[model samples]
Target chain A: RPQIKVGVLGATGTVGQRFIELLAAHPYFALHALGASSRSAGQQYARVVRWKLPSPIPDAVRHMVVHECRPDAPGFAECGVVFSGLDADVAGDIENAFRAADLVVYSNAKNYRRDPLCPLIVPLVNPSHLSIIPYQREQLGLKKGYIVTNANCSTTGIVVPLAALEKAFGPLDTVIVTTLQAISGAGVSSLDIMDNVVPLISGEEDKIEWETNKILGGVTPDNKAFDLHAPKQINVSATCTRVPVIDGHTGCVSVKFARSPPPSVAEVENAFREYTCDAQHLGVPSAPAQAIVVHDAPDRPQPRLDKNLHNGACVSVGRIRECPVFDIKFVCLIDNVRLGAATSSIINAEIAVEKGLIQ
Target chain B: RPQIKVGVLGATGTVGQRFIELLAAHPYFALHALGASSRSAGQQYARVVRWKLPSPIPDAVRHMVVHECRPDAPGFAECGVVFSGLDADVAGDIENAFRAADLVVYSNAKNYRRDPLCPLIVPLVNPSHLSIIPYQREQLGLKKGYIVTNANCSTTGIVVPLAALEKAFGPLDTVIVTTLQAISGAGVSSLDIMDNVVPLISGEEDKIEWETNKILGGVTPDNKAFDLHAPKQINVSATCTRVPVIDGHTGCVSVKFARSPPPSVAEVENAFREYTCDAQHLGVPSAPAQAIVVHDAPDRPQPRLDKNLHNGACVSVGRIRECPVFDIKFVCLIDNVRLGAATSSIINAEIAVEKGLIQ
Candidate 1:
């Protein structure tokens, strides 16, 4: 396969830098367009981005001219897919503009996720949700333009294995999750989170509560509508907070199956280990070897120790045990910038390419 | 009233520094003995301590020679009260020896908290549990000598308000707490936790779960055994994680009252504001003006912002709201080293002094 040129929206932002790095090394997805603020427009990517990652900026993108984040920006129109790492504030209008301009968009922003026309996708959990893309395109009277939004960072950690459980055992009755997130960037400064915990992340809980349904739900029989797993009668409660951790998001999850008695802890662990996804089976370049790593150590899946496992593209789960209130309880971790953000966008685009949705 | 001489065990660790600071300024408790390991024994406090606090060490304690943590070490025997901030490993035998030597001990260590005779007292919540001390002394055949333990760091934050709720509106049936704690010294460098959440704290969840019932429960009528919150049949599920913060512990709590249709959010807030402790009623120097400070701002109880409110002696509660699964939900913050440890012991000793239990 020839390299498919990909543009990056919000190119100077944290997630945008992540997409640039991952795309730089991608086998098929070529790093091309660099889009950020107008102040950076016409400037070189290296000069504009405050590059902080250990890996230096890729030579190919370093001298690339940054453009304003618009659909018809000089470099964007030449690309096959546009990966968006824009903030929610500007993402809604900008991504919508790109989609209306007949470009496919894989967005990390939450703005369009709840839109009936957009597919809320977590690549490992539900590439199948992409079946709704045609309907969404048809609804907008466009031929090849659509927006696919990935789950929130914390939601991405929890839903990977949840999709596994639903695939293996059937529907779950309830999901109660508490997420410990890091502040601002994928990192925290000693001065900021040194001796404290911020128990609230603005609008974080709502995103987890809302995005889970669309990501876990199925396409209608006609493939034109989403079921939202409503028939499964699932309820979700999410409590999200910014912790001192820098990159990984940790979720303490308790789930109850609709069935009278849920599977034992061992069975749950097996299900997680054996779980496969479209990205994995399709052998997408960014797909983690194991979409979910079932850890045996009681305290495995801790953010510090497990976040980089499988190159931050997989979820790590441990401490699977009986829950008095729910059927089972476990802890899970994800590199919020990788599986939760940029890598997810790239993987979704990879899956799209494999499925013939991206040209 | 003249100042009462006091001794401090483990007087070089973080908690010990806090004890020194509070006692240095305390109206009634005079800074007297300084105790540490053999490495520091006979050394001046200023030379031995790796003082981390912004405030300078008190002049009185600065030149004092550090001693072995024996009850009779130079200044301990003349002391009216002894505060122990030793770690659990060495605390058991040392606190035992102190009690056997007829020294009244207020301990922050977990060593004897679960012992039937020891009073697991959270000064702001269960100083009444001190009734068990007489029995403890009787069993050891030592007058004026007994151990009173404060709740674990995280437990101290939640149970203080839980006790407040229990005091005003009967007993609670269930409590679900998820703590995001600060990582000041996990050897987790700032580079490590800058943007990460360490999802597991070794033995932390167990401490919160096991200690909640003990702190919230009462001494039996005969003062021979703790009822372990038995009459209320309370169940607590805790998940503890180390976050990037430095000083405070933040807890997300949902509680169910034994009574159906638990109190409204406003009622709960009012209860927190109006709640008083035996220490407060006695007007002790270490007692905060309010036992629980209820913040009006939904996000006000953040650790970095609110941990020092009321001199780090009061629990800060905010975002009191309805919990769909439980009756009420709220966020609370505690300065882990103060109200959660050293300050708690000081208040306990103050109350003991007023009650004629301390000579």
Candidate 2:
């Protein structure tokens, strides 16, 4: 396989910096361009982005000239793929423009999540969703170009457990989630007061509520499908709050089943544990060792303790028990930037390459 | 009423500093003696205890000689009352010796809570418990001496709502509590990590469960009192966690009622809001303007935002909703050291003075 050249749009933000960090020594791709907002157009990557990771930014990306995401930027057409981390208002047009220019875009933006052609993917849960790339290429009349999206950070944590359960049991009935999300999910500068805690994130509940159904719902035989629309409903009630943590979103979830299934708590635990050490053990340059690691200790999956597990690719789950209302209750923690966004996007690009959609 | 001279035992510890802070400007008592562990003895009070509070240590207490809390100490018997904040191992004997010397001891230690004659008091919740003081004085053959205790920090927040509900609902059947407790509750210099979190607090869950029943259980008409055995059962399940916060214990509680109560959610909320305001609203020196404040916002009772309400004397509650398993669910926050320990103990002493238990 030829080394695919990649460009990072909005490369100076928190999620963007994560993308640069994750792709520092790519096995299948070469980093070619760094683009940012107008304010950072002429500065070097190191001078522009105040990187927050414990490890220093790679020297290769440190001196890269940051260009504005305008139509006339040099080498914009030379790159085969672009990973976007732009703000929503500007992301929609920029992402669409890049796709129209025959560049495959793997984005973390919500702008095109509902588009029939775009596949919202979590590689472990719905890698098969990448099959829809052909339909999107046909609709846009592009020789080899499409848009793929990763789910919301909070949605990723909930959906993974739901997907695992849905595969074992036929379908899901309802999910109730209370999320103690980190301050970093709000972006680098959102939390400045030393010890203050903000309990609400605007538009977060809606994202979790809608995205759960879409990601868990399977595709129809006609090749046109909505999320699981059976009379057996998939209703999600979410209460999201921002805590003083630096990374990771931790969720306490109570889920109900339509019909009782055969899997016991031990069986489910075994399944999640086995999935991590299996062949898909985040073996791809971007994948974590385990997609999901179920902890045996009751007080496990704590943000500060488990957030860095598998270097942010693995979702750590603990305190699993039978809920009085739901069939199961557990707490899960995920690194919002890596496994939830940048790394998930990289996995989608990997799927695109495996299917020969990107060369 | 002559001013009751008071001394603080373990006066250099966390709760001891709080005791001194509360007593510095107290109307009913004067701080005349300060004592600490053997290590801190023979130093000036200010030099021995590095106060963690925002307010400065009282000038009157700064120069006071710190004496060792041995079996015999100069001026120990001269104090009319003592407030004890000693470590558990030493508190048992030290408090007993002070009370034997005819000093009224208001303690925040857990050692004597189960002692038959000791009145475990939350002032507003169980002021009648003070009646046992005369019995304790007679048992010890003392003229004017008794021991009264404040409940554990976590217990204080939940007990308020539980007591308020018991008045209306008759009895509670079950309680599911998840507490995000602050690190300061573990005491200063106990843990060595900075900007991190610990998922477990030793003995906190047992304290919340045991203290809940003792505080709510009734006293018998016969001088031989028994705890209430007829609420069918109040089953409490708790998961106590310590966060990196400096103060405040925030509890997320789900409660089940034994009977189908007549009160609606609005009525229950109104009960907490109005009960505290009307019952304990006298401008008592340490009483919060509103003992129980209900926030309409979903993401409240957060430590950083609500801990300072009424200078930590009030309990802030939010996210009140009907639970699927339990009848009702809500989250509450109280400054663990203030309303939970020091301020409440001060109020108990004031009540003792009012009732002529100490002179």
Candidate 3:
């Protein structure tokens, strides 16, 4: 059995809670250490963590001792891989320490996403980008130590479809996306969004625009660095807003293909339906059977009704039609806290395991 | 006071309820009749309305019996203006009957919004479009009756800001608006949107695209026809979604002006802050003190936070900035039930009164 011990950083946070839920019954990645704020340290996970998911906390993790997010904290040093759901402010330094101490770090924070030495990977779209790890570690002067990042919640949803389209129809010339993100993603009070949408999500738009190039691009043949699709040149414009929805992040996407006389709507749907990813090919437990669900209903890909399909692992795409300005336009839904964050990290790790990056 | 009596059609629906609330304490247009479906007819409004509003049912309308919507219904005959909140299925025939009977009709339904003879008036942007009324009346051969339609909820929110931009700049070349509309605006099941966003609202996108030009266009100099912005030649594309919000409809808009070197972001903010509409100058009872509230706060104009500013009569604009693709971009919000729906009809009726067309 090639099972490995994994610890969760920021174990009490909303994103961390999703990790605990997914990792609780994980077939291979055994839930080991629980790391959190200093306040939760030394307490039983059951008593300290306020679980937000509907299911009860797992017995395996419930009685585990919560440790502060330090490299030598109880259980962390022994972890083969550490999954981090830490907040950005604290995650930057904590994750760097874990990596410096020769641990594999998979993070859901915005901290090191753009760091040239870290591979910002979206498992479904850019698991191959993980090839840059040897280069990353060489630059950092560490053995068996690296940090990998999944794209931001909203970015993960759009890029998956973008990857599918590029694989089928070649490079995309321009993409414009407007996201109606859920309140849970904001970590704000319900009062702020009860009957409203906040148009600006600070730094969110820039994150999406920048991350797209990195995630959709390929790794160098020498495994030295990323090639950010500069040769094909994908221009991404994003407008991110926070809606009153609780879970799913919805994106309205318009994409223009690099190919003139872009693929028809039917062909685009076919491309989405037939889409496959590295995680799926690796047969990971967390990998969704269908990476993308092509909805037949015209008014579909709705966040509430479609977000839970395949238990929030798969992306849902609908309303594929020709755009006057762009080649094609569609809508997509992703459970922001699940596949958009935690599940992708698990899948990325699983891809690492299959590739023998972990033993 | 040139007092005039008004009857409300589809009075048990969401839109009708707003008319009842506003007219109950109106300065000129007295609430004379309340009409609803046969199922709700004959019941006191307070007894039947599944009111979602925060305020108590207005005392003046609490016991007002709901009549079945018909041209010859007991109270509609003497009404100077018959306001419609009817569904499209029923509104088409009912509003036509009221017009044939020589009663002024102001509708919140889509049935007549695209009707060539019906001036699609968004009071703030195109009450001047009301000049087509004489032509409409001349064609219909009615002395005191004409149907005045208003833009859809999403369209109403975006067009006010568009009109303000065009009012300051010479003309707009294109507009791309993505709206996060509220659930109440869709009238869908609460279960459908409790934690979700519906990516498509059928017919909503087309309504915005087509109505923008009509609402922003000037009437022909003859006052007998609408120019429909033919000379300015505008292009509009919209992506509409229904969010979990209750009332406010929010739009992320990017506009390209015909004139090169478009208005700067500060000039755009200054324009929105200083823009005035005929409703204010005409001193209508319902005209907002500020036609458009230009929010200085970076995160201002949030739906829950700003939807009620100026009693929902004003459109809120914020995040005015240069767009990567277009000349400039901004976020605008309107209370779906207020300025976007019921209040626009009321304001348009008031404009008609000021123009001596409501006599």
Cα distance off (Å), candidate 3, residue A152: 2.8
**Which predicted model would earn the best DockQ?**
3
Q: lDDT tens string, model 1, A291-358? A: 78888876567676675675444688888887656688888887665565887788888888988899
Tens digit per residue, CA lDDT, model 2, B1-359: 46788888888887888888888887767887888877878889888787878889888788899998853576677777788887787788888888777777888888888787887877657766776676777888988777888777688888888878887777888776767677667663433323334445667777777677777776666554536434455767665666657777777777778787546789788877765532254355676666788888766767876766653357868888776445787778876755757778877777776677767
lDDT of each residue in A276-349, candidate 3, tens digit only:
88878878778888888999998897777775676335688899987766678888888665575888898889
The best candidate in terms of TM-score: 3
lDDT of 2: 0.73
**Candidate 3, DockQ score (0 to 1):** 0.57
Model 3 interface RMSD, one decimal: 1.5
What would the per-residue lDDT of candidate 2 be over residues A1-359, giving only the tens digit for each residue?
46888889989987788888877767867778888988999899999788877799998788899998854586667777889988898999999888888887888888998887787777767766766677778888988767888877788887887777776666777676767667667553534434544545778877887777767775666555544445455877666666667767877777677776645688778766755421264355555666688888766776766666754456877777665445777778776655757777887787667666777
Name the runs in model 1 displaced over 4 angstroms: A2-8, A11-21, A29-80, A183-196, A297-299, A302-307, A311-313, A322-324, B1-7, B11-80, B183-196, B310-313
lDDT of each: 0.81, 0.73, 0.83
Q: What is the interface RMSD of candidate 2, in Å?
A: 3.8
Worst 10 residues of 2 chain B by lDDT: B188-197
Q: Where does candidate 3 stray beyond 4 Å?
A: A5-7, A12-24, A30-79, A311-313, B5-7, B11-14, B30-79, B222-224, B311-313
Docking class of 2: incorrect
Which rank order by lDDT, best down to worst? Answer: 3, 1, 2
Q: What digit string (tens of lDDT, one per residue) describes model 1 on residues B73-188?
A: 89898887889989888999998888888988889877887888888888888888878778888888888888888776677888889989999999988777788876642356
User: DockQ rank, highest first?
Assistant: 3, 1, 2
Candidate 1 local Cα displacement, residue A86, angstroms: 3.4
The true-versus-predicted C-alpha distance at residue A332 of model 3, in Å, is 0.8
